[PDB]
Amino acid sequence: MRVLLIHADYFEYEVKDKALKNPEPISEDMKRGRMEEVLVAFISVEKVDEKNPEEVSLKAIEEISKVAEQVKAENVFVVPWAHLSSELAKPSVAMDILNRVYQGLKERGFNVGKAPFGYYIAAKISCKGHPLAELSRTIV
Amino acid sequence: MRVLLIHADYFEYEVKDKALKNPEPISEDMKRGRMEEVLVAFISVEKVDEKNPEEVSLKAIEEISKVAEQVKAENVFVVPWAHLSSELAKPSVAMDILNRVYQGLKERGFNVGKAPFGYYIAAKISCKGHPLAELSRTIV
């Protein structure tokens, strides 16, 4: 799994077309979302993560939480994201891990949002420019 | 070299603190920049790119130009970017390649902007959500 963490003034998204034939089902009010003062976790779930969804999930929950504590973010937003890896997991593995990660950050105490899986999504972001506002983590 | 290409409604940046002790020198009016309808090329120059700045530059110019032609972007914005690689080049190599890339896209005919090297930078982006609006390329 590779993750890119961005500490943002805001993150907002709008779902556009489906990218999978059978993407994640969504209500009309999950087509758009917005958080402020939020750590956004762009997560690319890799093929090698199939080998251990549980351990990879737990590690990602901790890494993301560490950063959120350090930058004083109470809001965390999980984003399914193809673009940090060229060995992507199957949709079932990816969705499994992304949900685990999401539920774990909620148990940790954060206010957690997530973007639906399997869609092309337009999005707007404002990235803070402090030393810790953009970080990469590799988790395996 | 790894590159992330984002087709954006707009990209805007403001330079914050220096990240290097001796970053790229800048005038007051390069502290902030903005382009609309722009392909933004986030470029992580890697250690392995030291071996051949010229070939790696030429390849990156072509890949970025291919995408710009395909998405009908006339504006291209080059962004120095640590976050797609964990084997980063020395600042001299990185700046060498980023300038080559910048000059090449200008020769190709694009309207090209660039962010200064060596700074923490706040930035705002609006990413189009069409199938080709976010692409990753590895160039070696």
Curated annotation (Swiss-Prot), chains A, B:
Region annotated Editing domain, chain positions: 1-140
Result for mutant: residue 120 to A: Isolated domain has nearly wild-type deacylation of mischarged L-seryl-tRNA(Thr), no longer binds L-Ser or L-Cys. No activity on threonyl-tRNA(Thr). Same results
Effect on the protein upon substituting residue 83 to A: Isolated domain has decreased to no deacylation of mischarged L-seryl-tRNA(Thr). Deacylates correctly charged glycyl-tRNA(Gly)
UniProt subcellular location: Cytoplasm
Coiled coil: none
Family: Belongs to the class-II aminoacyl-tRNA synthetase family.
Task performed by this protein: Catalyzes the attachment of threonine to tRNA(Thr) in a two-step reaction: L-threonine is first activated by ATP to form Thr-AMP and then transferred to the acceptor end of tRNA(Thr). Edits incorrectly charged L-seryl-tRNA(Thr) via its editing domain. Deacylates correctly charged glycyl-tRNA(Gly), but neither glycyl-tRNA(Gly)(2'-dA76) (the terminal 2'-OH of tRNA(Thr) adenine 76 has been replaced by hydrogen) nor the 2'-fluoro tRNA derivative do so, strongly suggesting the editing function is tRNA catalyzed.
Quaternary structure annotation from Swiss-Prot or TrEMBL: Homodimer.
Domain-level remarks: The N-terminal domain (about residues 1-143) is an archaea-specific tRNA-editing domain that has a highly similar structure to Dtd (D-aminoacyl-tRNA deacylase); the domain binds L-serine and L-cysteine and most D-amino acids but not L-threonine. Editing of incorrectly charged L-seryl-tRNA(Thr) by this domain is tRNA catalyzed.
Protein name: Threonine--tRNA ligase
Organism ancestry: Archaea, Methanobacteriati, Methanobacteriota, Thermococci, Thermococcales
